[PDB]
Design a protein around this ligand. Sequence first.
Ligand code: HEM
Ligand SMILES: N[C@@H](Cc1c[nH]c2ccccc12)C(=O)O
Ligand SMILES: OCCc1c[nH]c2ccccc12
Ligand SMILES: [C-]#N
Length: 378
Amino acid sequence: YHIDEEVGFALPNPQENLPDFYNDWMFIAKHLPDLIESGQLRERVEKLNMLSIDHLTDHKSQRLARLVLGCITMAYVWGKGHGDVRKVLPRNIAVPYCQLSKKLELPPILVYADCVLANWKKKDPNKPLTYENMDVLFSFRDGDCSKGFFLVHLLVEIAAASAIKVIPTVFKAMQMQERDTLLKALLEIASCLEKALQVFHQIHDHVNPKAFFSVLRIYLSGWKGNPQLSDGLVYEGFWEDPKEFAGGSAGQSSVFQCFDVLLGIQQTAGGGHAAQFLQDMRRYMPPAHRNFLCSLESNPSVREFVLSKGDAGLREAYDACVKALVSLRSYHLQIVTKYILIPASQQPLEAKGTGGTDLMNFLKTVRSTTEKSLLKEG
Ligand code: HEM
Ligand SMILES: N[C@@H](Cc1c[nH]c2ccccc12)C(=O)O
Ligand SMILES: OCCc1c[nH]c2ccccc12
Ligand SMILES: [C-]#N
């Protein structure tokens, strides 16, 4: 399902530079801070050629092109970020992006898989994976803190993906009726999620609230139920009409949905607005990751197994994992308070996320549903 023991769902060292045929593309993406502040970005994209996508070799190259075309499309649509919006996207950039998006089974807009999972490099390949030894490929503006913002996600993915290699043990242990193995395995998955919470903490160090809310957040925004492009973005040449597509969010990460599926926390059940979002966001993941969540869903329920056995140590191990998810979501709400709610209040009905959710009801519903799945002695 394209999963690595070392790095998780991220590409193990993604493609940094394209074939030379797409040098028009790579120049605009690499120098986005300057071109946007100059006010000359839109002319530079409007004055382009319609480059055909046939000469992109493999998956790693196509995933860099997604990121290049995606970043460019955001810089073009939003502009300097003040209100001057572009409701129509040029035929020269839009058609190859739509064609590349249809080939990779993704929507034509920047997603988590682009701007986090394909948007990094190792400085000194020998040394271990960390904030000092890592750097993003692309930023949007100067002082947008995109290095810290994107890489904190990637490091939390990596921390959480230590658990993903334990999953086959869990289902093998249930199938073979091996209780002690299943107990050990669940505690290891809990241990990984606790360590993922510690990796989360550094967002305060590497990301400034005002920088995030006012500068960066507008470039991660999309155009599905967005007042600025209410009908949607027009992909000229490729599509007849405007088309709505949700903006980027960590809700588009597979790691952060898979533990709910693993543990039998039914976030996607019920038909309410939150479940609908979390399901819909699986179409904003690359197909291999969508299949991982699928495969995991098709397995027998760990929850049902644990409740059936009348076993305290097994229930407690299971609860460790659920607690860890509740801790992450509770902390994420504190991050939302510092990085959205307070910044929004210093700005001269319902607050909307970049993905389009009613964020405070949404997030608390998702945390609530997680808490309800705590067993507590059967
Ligand atoms: C400045 C930092 C952050 C802000 C302001 C923020 C804000 C939000 C918002 C508003 C949503 C609701 C969905 C939407 O409409 O977009 C959301 C969902 C989510 N965020 Fe974040 N977020 C941040 C960082 C993170 C990080 C670092 C992670 C994980 C490593 C994360 C994981 C999630 C997940 C998994 C969801 C989906 C709902 C859930 O399962 O709890 N977020 N976030
Ligand atoms: N949904 C967040 C933005 C966000 C947080 N983490 C992300 C990761 C990728 C893309 C977007 C995001 C907001 O409304 O502010
Ligand atoms: O909202 C908290 C973010 C989150 C949900 N599930 C996860 C699993 C691993 C790491 C972070 C998360
Ligand atoms: C978090 N989006």
